[PDB]
Amino acid sequence: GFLGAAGSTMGAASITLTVQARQLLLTVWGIKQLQARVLAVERYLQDQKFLGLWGCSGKIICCTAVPWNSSWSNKTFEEIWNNMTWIEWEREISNYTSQIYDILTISQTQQEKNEKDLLE
Amino acid sequence: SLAEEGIIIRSENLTNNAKTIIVHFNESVKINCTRPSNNTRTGIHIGPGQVFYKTGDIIGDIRKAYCNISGAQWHKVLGRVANKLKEHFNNKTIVFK
C-alpha cells in the first residue's frame, strides 16, 4: 500500500506517505502459507523493534534530536526534498544506515537517562 | 494471455541457436481437437483395491484423432510472425521446416 507516489517528489511522497498508510480490514500450499505468514510477522516485528527502540513506538512521522554532520550528506533541505526521491535518498545514505541507527539508539538512551535523573 | 497490438518474439540469447525462441500472439487462432472413437473402458481387479482400467473394443465405427487448424488465419498469423522475425534477423528469408 506504500508503493503509491514512489517516483514523486519528496513533498508529494510525504503528503502521500500517509494517504494510503494502511486500510487493513502437509500440503505444499499450506507450507507456503505458513512460511509467508511467519516471514511477514518477522518483518513487522523487526520494524517495530527499531521504531520502539529509537523511541518512536507507534508514530508515523517520528522526530529525533540527533545532529546531521556533513558526512552522511552535504546538501541543503530544498535540494534534498526537491532534487531527489525516497529511493535516491536511501541509496545516498545506504551504507551510513548502521551508524545512524547506532547514534539514534545512543541518543535515545542518553535522553531517557537524563529525564529519569532530572525527574527528582 | 494475448498481446496488445503486435507479435512479440522474446528469447534470452537470440544470437545463440541453442536457446528456444518464444513467440507471443497479437491474435489467437482457435483449434479443434477431438477423438470420435467411442471407447468402452473396463476395470479389472489386480489386487486388494488395485483396480486397473484397460481399453476395450471400440464399439461403433473406428476413427483416428485429429486437430483442425483454420488455414487462412494460421497462414496469416505465420506470415505476421515471419515479418516480425525478419527485423530481428536482418531481413532474411524466414523458412519453417
Epitope: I87, E88, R91, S94 | E12, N13
Partner: nanobody, 130 residues
C-alpha cells in the same frame, strides 16, 4: 563471459570523420547494460566523451555537435554493437579510444548513479593518429 572487442587502428586526415565500432560479447541487451565512451590521450589522464544509456545519447560539455553515439541491440548473428562517430577531427583528437560497458540491472550495486557511472568492462582500444 563479458568480452569487449572493437575495430582496429588507422590513420586519417584533419577534417575527416572517424567511425569506431565496439562489439559487445556476452552483453544481453543495451537496455540493462550501459556503454560509455572514454578517451585516453597518449601519456595523459583519461577523458569522458559520452554515453547511450538505455537508448539515451549524451555527450560531455566540450562534445556538443561534435560526437554522435549509435547503438544496435541483439541480432540473429551479430552481437550488440555501439559505434562512435566524430566529425571535424583536429590534431588534438589523436588518442586511444576505449569502449566501456557496465551492468545497470541492480540499482543498489553502486556501479551507476543517475546516469553517471563506473566502467566495469573495457575494450582493447583503438589508436588514432594523423
Amino acid at each position: 563471459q563479458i568480452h569487449l572487442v572493437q575495430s582496429g587502428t588507422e590513420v586519417k586526415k584533419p577534417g575527416s570523420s572517424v567511425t569506431v565500432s565496439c562489439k559487445a560479447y556476452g552483453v544481453n541487451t543495451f537496455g540493462l547494460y550501459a556503454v560509455n565512451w572514454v578517451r585516453q590521450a597518449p601519456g595523459q589522464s583519461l577523458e569522458y566523451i559520452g554515453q547511450i544509456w538505455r537508448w539515451k545519447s549524451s555527450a560531455s560539455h566540450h562534445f556538443r555537435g561534435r560526437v554522435l553515439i549509435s547503438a544496435v541491440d541483439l541480432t540473429g548473428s551479430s552481437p550488440p554493437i555501439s559505434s562512435l562517430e566524430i566529425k571535424n577531427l583536429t590534431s588534438d583528437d589523436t588518442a586511444v579510444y576505449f569502449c566501456t560497458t557496465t551492468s545497470t540491472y541492480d540499482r543498489w550495486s553502486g556501479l551507476h548513479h543517475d546516469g553517471v557511472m563506473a566502467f566495469s568492462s573495457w575494450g582493447q582500444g583503438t589508436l588514432i593518429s594523423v
